Write a protein that binds this ligand. Structure first.
Ligand code: ATP
Ligand code: ADP
Ligand code: MG
Ligand code: MG
Ligand code: ZN
Ligand code: ZN
Ligand code: ZN
Lengths: 294, 101, 308, 409, 611
DNA sequence: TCGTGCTGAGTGATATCTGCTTTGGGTGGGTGGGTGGGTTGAGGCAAT
DNA sequence: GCAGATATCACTCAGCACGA
């Protein structure tokens, strides 16, 4: 009656073969062995492999149709069409046995309330700085995420993604003029993420630095950011303990600055000039391409 | 000179001294105007014509306009002791051009 | 099948144009006098005050013309032509040796003094085909172009002639040859000499700055002027137009000889279903056909003559 | 102004009726209805308006069907037979609009001519073409008959409107020679199957019947002379021809059917009047037998086909068709003839809100005829279960059950 | 008897219609209070009345075709508990049923009540319902395929809206042969065109043509919504979702506004190419909006008029404008009179005169200057918190740019222009280049800015009040030297300002003690701000003082006396006029009395300070 | 009074056919590819 | 190999006149 995929409400994923299991039972693990975008060649197409890299782009979740459902205004019968490619052609005339025996030219109309959809995301993974050979530029590999794995990848993250390396055959006239070159992608299947108190917590601001105990106490107070910010009928009182360290060259200021500034979960070390072209506070620059002040 | 709308070719767009042909033009704060802009109205004041030789637009327009302006002193208030030229940053040519003060 | 309502509106318009009069300082027929004025001075446009229309016939005529103007416009022109024939026969035709170029005069009716004035932001789709007045600032003015009004084609097979073909929005050619024997159905040649053309000018207007909400981008609109109302609006100044709000289709989809077919992220899908649009969809764009334009803002003897 | 206001008020009512079928939301809003029939099956109908009203849902389901049965309409233009455009092929309602002055001048000219010399012209023409009947060409026949009919109709209307004018100005209309000529032309046209001149003769005969009825009503004492003329025009052959005329009219143009309706109504009225007044003799003529000759399936088919175009029809035509329907239904009690299905569909279409105007004169007749027909049909259906299937197929012609089929006993 | 049923479900449409009609017919707000565990708040007048009957009657009297609906009200009733779930899960069918039921209810109300209202107006009017408050507000990053074709609630910031787009509703066809006209409906964006003329006499096939200018049309608009900055998880580019609004909701939300929208989360295919039926497998997601909410009564007027009778109204308002600031009564009073503003004058045979007041707050650093700036910035309906060295000459007035979408030359509104009718705020006036300050010369004098450059010659109205602050050249203010030296700024500029205050942080054993006790309690009643805003708005809109002879007789005296003791120019007299008019506005008087002008002159002398 | 064989007429389905690009521009991209091509100049504004 | 616009041919149906 209806296609089997329509009734399915689960997603099947494959977990790679861990190295420990392979060594335990005297076997070699090809899927779990991490690779780089450089080493993913055409020979690996159609296999379950793992890729190590940094995510550099993610897309919004969009519904990718899997089984379209139509309704005939004459029969009252529903027609289901499987879609398993980047493109499909909608049905026009009913193919039901009722429209055949009566040979009525009933029209099929799409109904999104009965179709099947799967969350879709497209991402990009790039090589780490430790995998690019000298004189070569980093490469990027597209990743497709379907099912429940969507939203498990975010920009700027180091991951070990296992998936199926498949091509994407072209359709229509594009196939003839495109040639034999095939655009490939990765179908994600698994993702692994690479993850006197006062005096004591003061002499530990930069154990390496020797002197400046009171200064270290002040930096600890800065770290705590001690305040209970008070907002009444609109008045706002700042809750930040600013501090400055003047003196002469030689005293341990910059070392203290980088230690104190690494200790906090969030920090930004910059010179008085600012972060590159834009100076400290902010600046408006003409867009090189769009010529719009940004 | 601004590129033509829906065109790759430049064209001349009128200005304040062109829309006021055979009319009176008003400038509120003459002193605050930059020196670069002040010298712009030098040919229109006496020659009564504007000549531009910008991109492939060689032309000689006509602006027969009377210009009336209001200016503040160099400082905050008019100094009785200093002369007119002393009070205003305007130099000899512009002052000579003006009919009355 | 004739349109009874259209003919009745035509008769009412004829009666209004004929018998209407206004008390002067004497009583004189305003519109018969105006028609005589045109006859003497060879004018095409006849200006009609909307308040006069509303005054007469309990306002039913005014309601009919205002609510549905695109529908009733041809009937008004028919009534005007009948009145002109009745009173000034020679005005119908266009004006040492004989001249064979005597074409029909294309009269134009201009309505003004509308009780209400709208804004570009107040334009809505509920009032397409209605008589309304708007105000704006002229931002651009395209050059005057000739517009194909009533074409005249000759068959390429038997060299027949088919005349008085009405062009709606695109280049429209005949379909069936009038000659019973000929088999031609799609091959025609335009007779550019026997055709008729109208002056055409497109004017873009943006809503006046003060009317705009604070910190909002002005909204633009396209206005079409024809006949004697060309090169009246000028860039920069502020003008008051009166006319009919129309909607222009995407003519490329309908099928144009030589041309090939064809913010919102795919949501601007038009309407499909016509036989002409085999698989394509037609999208619309609002415009404005203006019939009246108003500008909101040598020697001694010449000036003295003007002075009263 | 008053006419324009009335027309605008009618258009507003039509717009209000149309608005009831339009959705408040836009086209792409969506919404699918699933209407289940009694045999546990559901059909899908789209549209917002179909959700609330079942009639709209069924109507849309009907319209969605693509296949259409054939309709072949072979019609010949007047130019093919060398005739000019006239009432024969023009629309029933096409009216040439006149200015006040032009209309007044036209009225004055026609009135003067009729008062002056219509009789002499008709006498001369009829004598000349009686001398030359054989070589008549269709054009001349049609023109003469149309002129006669138009002038007689205009004189009748003028007499009805005002009594100042006289009805004797068309005296030659009742003169015997003209009647014989018209009858001979009509008979020849019927024999030779020339439908255009047949239609013209039908119109002329209708006008002659109207004239004779009006003159008899005006002066019954002097009608004794008129009684002579009627005896001639109701000959057995003529009666058969008139009875057959409606039967063939079904498969022809609308104007021919309108003329058939007019002629049948006039003939029935005159026959009833004369039968009631005195003993009608051509063979004594009884209204019952002539009425029976007019009750046949093709006549009802022609009438139904005529009423299918009620949208373009006038009030008088609707009144006349429904008067004949009442005659057949009640006077002769032949309800079996009208127990068809096309009539039911037509009645529902005309009584529907989108159909005939509710605030209209004809709707009274339509509603009354409906009420009566529905009541009688319900009674018969309760009595005879088998009629549930008889409503579709045409009546039988079998001797064994024909009597029971028709009269129910 | 065929049974109408919503496709894919088992809900009878007749049941929905009857339940909704019953709910509308008999619903009292007391049920809503009972549901929310607010039983003790039930009154006997508003909660004992047929809510939606009054709503529909008001609709009819005002001639409107809209009824806003609350889903929680549906939950409150007994018969419409399942209708809430049905509306949530099948929004389109339920919405259509509700619209039709509303129209039927209006018709039945008119007919049964035996009113004289003509049925024509209601019959031809389309009625639409706009449900809102339909549940928790989903995030723009939490919409999954599961939630397709269901009613959701969103909140975001409007980024850009397209112009009005005409959407066809009913098509119009005319036969080319017999000139017969018929109208056909449109279903799912498809014209149900006829194959041949519908007339019987004329049946020529393919002779029907579409008359473009006689088809009925509706309004369509496309908006882009950006999620609120708070929802951003880890500081990336915020996502955006497209919205569609039709009919009334068109031109309801402007660019750069925070709105809450309820609609259906729809999905639609995208065609791969223009000239084929082929479709992409990825569907476009968007929202079909059905409701939008942008995030005076006689009783209030009777209440407001009661405050004006209070003798100590001046002190009350001056103490409520800035509750936190301590012992700055004169500064607060001066600030308050700026919010009210002078009196507007339309004046032909010349130019318009505007009653806008400019105040300068220059003094020692630690005193509450910026705090008052923020406090006033909150109150005013319009205003830009521009600072020193963070704003440019062009940035304040207007910026010439081009519109990419339209490819036309347009101009943006600067800080001063964006404050039209409000009060502009400047923090560091001294730390501003004189090149930019020259812009303010025209704003404070003519209340307009004229720009002529690169083909754009137009004037933008900048009818705004300026409130600036400055700090002394030194670390503090030195009383010994004159004012023109301590604060910087050109001497002439200081004369333009209507009032120029001078607040200094003197050192004392009691003032400092009281201030410390006041700023430490954070770890004499004041009016609530909500009522104060209404007060000032009513005063600014309705009242319009007119000067009296007694005012002039002594205003001439005051101005001549000010000039005699000696800086004092006509601007001071105009400032006195504006201040006297503004103070009268506070007490809701149409005539300026001697007392108000006396207070104005009193304020002016005691601002610079009476050495 | 009527029944049926012959005819012209008109759709329905199916045969060949052209076309399968197309296009200047960065909210169409660069895993679509350069044998499909894109070659300014003035004026305004931030930085200083 | 694929979708769309176009034109070709073949088959079947409602009317017509005559003969039963
Ligand atoms: N108390 C101390 N304990 C340990 N090392 C110290 C101490 N004082 C100074 N130093 C050493 O002095 C050297 C000074 O170099 P450093 O990077 O600190 O420069 P700086 O003068 O502090 O920087 P800047 O002047 O650029 O802010 C560092 O190597 C630091 O190790
Ligand atoms: N009279 C006062 N009332 C309330 N707070 C005060 C007062 N005087 C000083 N302060 C406090 O001192 C601080 C002064 O900072 P700020 O107002 O930014 O000074 P400025 O803006 O003039 O540099 C404020 O945060 C405020 O809490
Ligand atoms: Mg350092
Ligand atoms: Mg400050
Ligand atoms: Zn089907
Ligand atoms: Zn030809
Ligand atoms: Zn037709």
């Amino acid at each position: 009656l209806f296609p089997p995929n329509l009734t399915r409400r689960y997603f099947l994923y494959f977990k790679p073969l861990s190295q420990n299991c392979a060594r335990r039972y005297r076997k070699k693990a090809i899927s779990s062995k991490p690779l780089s975008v450089r080493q993913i060649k055409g020979d690996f197409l159609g296999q379950l492999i793992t890729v190590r890299g940094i995510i550099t782009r993610v897309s919004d979740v969009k519904p990718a149709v899997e089984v379209i459902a139509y309704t005939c205004d004459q029969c009252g019968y529903e027609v289901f069409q499987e879609v398993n490619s980047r493109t499909f052609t909608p049905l026009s005339e009913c193919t039901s046995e009722e429209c055949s025996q009566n040979q009525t030219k009933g029209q099929l109309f799409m109904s999104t309330r009965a179709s099947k959809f799967s969350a879709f995301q497209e991402c990009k993974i790039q090589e780490l700085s430790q995998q690019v050979p000298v004189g070569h530029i980093p490469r990027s590999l597209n990743i497709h995420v379907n099912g429940t794995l969507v939203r498990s990848l975010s920009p700027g993250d180091i991951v070990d993604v296992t998936g199926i390396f498949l091509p994407a055959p072209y359709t229509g006239f594009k196939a003839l003029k495109a040639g034999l070159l095939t655009e490939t992608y990765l179908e994600a299947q698994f993702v692994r993420q690479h993850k006197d108190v006062y005096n004591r917590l003061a002499k530990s601001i930069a154990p390496e630095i020797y002197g400046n105990l009171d200064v270290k106490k002040a930096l600890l107070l800065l770290l705590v950011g001690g305040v209970d910010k008070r907002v009444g009928d609109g008045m706002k009182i700042r809750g930040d303990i600013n501090v400055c360290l003047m003196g002469d060259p030689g005293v341990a200021k910059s070392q203290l600055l980088k230690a104190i500034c690494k200790i906090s979960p969030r920090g930004v070390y910059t010179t008085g000039k600012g972060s590159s072209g834009v100076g400290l506070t902010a600046a408006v620059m003409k867009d090189p391409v769009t010529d719009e002040m940004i | 000179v601004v590129r033509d709308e829906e065109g790759g070719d430049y064209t001349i767009e009128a200005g304040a001294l062109m829309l006021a042909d055979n009319g009176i033009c008003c400038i509120d704060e003459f002193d605050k105007m930059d020196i670069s802009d002040q010298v712009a109205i030098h040919e229109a004041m006496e020659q009564q014509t504007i000549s531009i030789a910008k991109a492939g637009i060689h032309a000689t327009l006509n602006a027969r306009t009377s210009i009336l302006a209001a200016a503040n002193p160099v400082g905050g208030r008019y100094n009785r002791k200093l002369s007119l030229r002393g009070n205003l940053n305007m130099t000899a040519p512009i002052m000579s051009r003006f009919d009355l003060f | 099948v004739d349109d009874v309502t259209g003919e009745k509106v035509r008769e009412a318009f004829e009666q209004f144009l004929e018998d209407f009069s206004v008390q002067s300082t004497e009583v004189e027929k305003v519109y018969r006098a105006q028609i005589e004025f045109m006859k003497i001075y060879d004018l095409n446009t006849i200006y009609i005050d909307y308040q006069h229309l509303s005054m007469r016939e309990n306002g039913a005529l005014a309601m009919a013309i205002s609510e549905q103007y695109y529908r009733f416009l041809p009937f008004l022109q028919k009534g005007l032509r009948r009145v002109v024939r009745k009173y000034a026969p020679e005005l119908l035709n266009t004006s040492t040796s004989t001249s064979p170029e005597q074409t029909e005069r294309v009269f134009q009716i201009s309505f003004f003094n509308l009780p209400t004035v709208h804004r570009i932001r107040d334009i809505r789709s509920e009032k397409i085909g209605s008589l309304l007045s708007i105000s704006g600032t002229v931002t651009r003015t395209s050059e005057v172009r000739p517009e194909l009004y009533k074409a005249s084609f000759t068959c390429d097979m038997c060299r027949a002639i088919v005349d008085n073909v009405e062009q709606s929005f695109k280049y429209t050619e005949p379909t069936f040859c009038p000659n019973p024997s000929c088999e031609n159905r799609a091959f025609w040649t335009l007779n550019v000499t026997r055709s008729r053309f109208l002056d055409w000018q497109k004017v873009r207007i943006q809503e006046n700055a003060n009317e705009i909400p604070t910190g909002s981008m002005p909204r633009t609109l396209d206005v079409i002027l024809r006949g004697d109302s060309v090169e009246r609006a000028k860039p920069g100044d502020r003008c008051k137009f009166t006319g009919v709000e129309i909607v222009v289709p995407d003519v490329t989809q309908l099928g144009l000889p030589g041309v090939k077919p064809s913010t919102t992220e795919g949501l601007n899908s038009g309407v499909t279903g016509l036989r002409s649009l085999g698989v394509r969809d037609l999208t619309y764009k609002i415009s404005f056909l203006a019939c009246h334009v108003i500008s909101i803002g040598r020697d001694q003897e010449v000036f003295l003559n003007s002075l009263s | 102004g008053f006419e324009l206001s009335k027309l605008l008020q009618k258009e507003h009512q039509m717009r209000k009726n149309v608005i009831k079928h339009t959705s408040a939301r836009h086209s792409r809003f969506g919404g699918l209805l699933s209407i289940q029939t009694p045999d546990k099956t559901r059909l899908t109908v789209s549209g917002s308006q179909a959700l609330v009203d079942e009639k709209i849902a069924l109507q849309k389901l009907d319209d969605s069907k693509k296949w259409n049965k054939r309709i072949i309409k072979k019609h010949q233009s007047v130019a093919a037979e060398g005739l000019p455009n006239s009432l024969l092929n023009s629309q029933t309602g096409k009216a040439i609009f006149f200015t006040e002055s032009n209309g007044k001048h036209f009225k004055e000219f026609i009135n003067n001519f009729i008062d002056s010399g219509f009789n002499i012209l008709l006498h001369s023409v009829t004598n000349y073409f009686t001398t030359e009947q054989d070589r008549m060409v269709t054009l001349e026949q049609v023109e003469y008959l149309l002129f006669f009919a138009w002038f007689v109709k205009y004189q009748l209307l003028r007499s009805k409107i005002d009594n100042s004018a006289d009805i004797k100005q068309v005296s030659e209309a009742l003169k015997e020679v003209t009647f014989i000529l018209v009858s001979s032309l009509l008979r020849s046209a019927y024999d030779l199957k020339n439908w255009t001149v047949t239609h013209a003769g039908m119109i002329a005969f209708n006008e002659l019947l109207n004239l004779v009825s009006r003159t008899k009503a005006a002066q019954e004492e002097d009608s004794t002379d008129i009684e002579f003329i009627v005896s001639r025009l109701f000959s057995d052959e003529r009666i058969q021809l008139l009875s057959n005329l409606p039967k063939i009219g079904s498969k022809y143009s609308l104007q021919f059917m309108k003329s058939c309706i007019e002629l049948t109504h006039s003939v029935l009225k005159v026959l009833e009047q004369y039968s009631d007044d005195k003993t009608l003799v051509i063979i004594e003529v009884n209204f019952q037998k002539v009425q029976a000759n007019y009750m046949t399936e093709p006549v009802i088919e022609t009438y139904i086909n005529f009423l299918e175009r009620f949208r373009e029809l006038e009030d008088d035509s609707i009144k006349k068709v429904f008067s004949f329907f009442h005659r057949v239904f009640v006077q002769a009690k032949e309800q079996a003839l009208l127990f068809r299905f096309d009539l039911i569909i037509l009645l529902r279409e005309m009584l529907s809100p989108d159909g005939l105007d509710r605030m209209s004169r004809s709707r009274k007749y339509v509603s009354q005829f409906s009420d009566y027909f529905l009541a009688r049909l319900k009674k018969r259906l309760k009595k005879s279960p088998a009629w549930f299937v008889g409503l579709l197929f045409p009546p039988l012609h079998n001797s064994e059950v024909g009597f029971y089929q028709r009269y129910g006993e | 008897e065929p049974l109408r049923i919503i496709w894919g479900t088992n809900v009878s449409i007749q049941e929905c219609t009857t339940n909704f009609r019953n709910f509308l017919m008999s619903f009292k707000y007391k049920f809503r209070k009972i549901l929310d565990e607010r039983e003790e708040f039930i009154n006997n007048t508003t909660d004992e009345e047929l809510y939606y009957i009054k709503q529909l009657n008001e609709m009819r009297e005002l001639g409107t075709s809209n009824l806003n609906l609350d889903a929680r009200n549906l939950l409150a009733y007994k018969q419409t508990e399942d209708l809430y779930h049905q509306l949530l899960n099948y929004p389109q069918e339920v919405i259509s049923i509700m619209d039709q039921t509303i129209k039927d209810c209006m018709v039945s109300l008119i007919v049964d009540n035996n009113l004289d209202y003509d049925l024509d107006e209601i019959e031809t009017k389309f009625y639409k319902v706009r449900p809102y408050n339909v549940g928790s507000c989903k995030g723009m990053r939490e919409l999954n395929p599961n939630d397709i074709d269901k009613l959701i609630n969103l909140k975001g910031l409007v980024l850009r809206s397209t112009p009005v787009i005409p959407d066809m509703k009913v098509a119009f066809f005319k036969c080319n042969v017999c000139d017969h006209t018929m109208a056909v409906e449109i279903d799912r964006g498809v014209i149900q065109e006829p194959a041949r003329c519908e007339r019987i006499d004329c049946n020529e096939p393919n002779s029907m043509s579409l008359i473009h200018n006689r088809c009925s049309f509706a309004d369509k608009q496309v908006i882009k919504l950006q999620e609120t900055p708070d929802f951003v998880p880890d500081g990336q580019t915020p996502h955006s979702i497209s919205l569609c609004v039709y009919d009334e909701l068109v031109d309801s939300c402007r660019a750069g506004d925070r709105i809450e929208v309820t609609g259906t989360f729809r999905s639609i295919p995208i065609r791969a190419n223009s000239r084929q039926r082929v479709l992409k497998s990825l569907y476009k997601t968007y929202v079909d909006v059905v409701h939008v909410k942008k995030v005076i009564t006689d009783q209030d007027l009777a209440k407001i008029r009661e405050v004006a009778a209070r003798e100590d109204l001046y002190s009350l308002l001056a103490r409520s404008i800035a509750p936190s600031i301590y012992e700055l009564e004169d500064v607060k009073k001066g600030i308050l009179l700026q919010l009210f503003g002078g009196t507007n004058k339309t004046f032909t045979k010349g130019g318009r005169y505007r009653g806008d007041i400019n105040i300068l707050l220059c003094g020692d650093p630690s005193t509450s200057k910026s705090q008052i700036l923020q406090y006033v910035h909150k109150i005013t309906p319009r205003g830009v918190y521009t600072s020193g060295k963070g704003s440019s000459a062009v940035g304040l007035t207007a910026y010439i740019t081009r519109d990419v979408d339209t490819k036309q030359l347009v101009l943006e509104s600067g800080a001063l222009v964006l404050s039209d009718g409000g009060v502009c705020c400047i923090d560091e006036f001294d730390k501003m280049s004189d090149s930019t300050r020259s812009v303010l010369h025209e704003v404070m004098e003519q209340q307009t800015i004229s720009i002529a450059k690169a083909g754009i010659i137009t004037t933008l109205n900048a009818r705004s009040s300026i409130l600036a602050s400055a700090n002394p050249i030194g670390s503090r203010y030195n009383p010994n030297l004159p004012v023109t030296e301590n604060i910087d700024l050109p001497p002439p500029l200081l004369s333009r300002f209507d009032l120029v205050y001078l607040v200094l942080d003197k050192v004392d054993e009691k003032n400092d003690r009281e201030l410390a006790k006041h700023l430490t309690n954070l770890y004499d009643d004041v009016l609530p701000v909500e009522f104060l805003t209404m007060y000032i708005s009513y005063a600014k809109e309705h009242i319009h003082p007119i000067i009296t002879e007694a005012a002039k007789t002594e205003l001439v005296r005051a101005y001549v006396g000010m000039r005699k003791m000696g800086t004092a120019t006509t601007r001071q007299l105009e400032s006195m006029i504006r201040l006297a008019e503004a103070h009268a506005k506070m007490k809701l008087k149409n005539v300026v009395e001697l007392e108000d002008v006396q207070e104005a002159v009193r304020l002016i002398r005691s601002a610079i300070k009476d050495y």
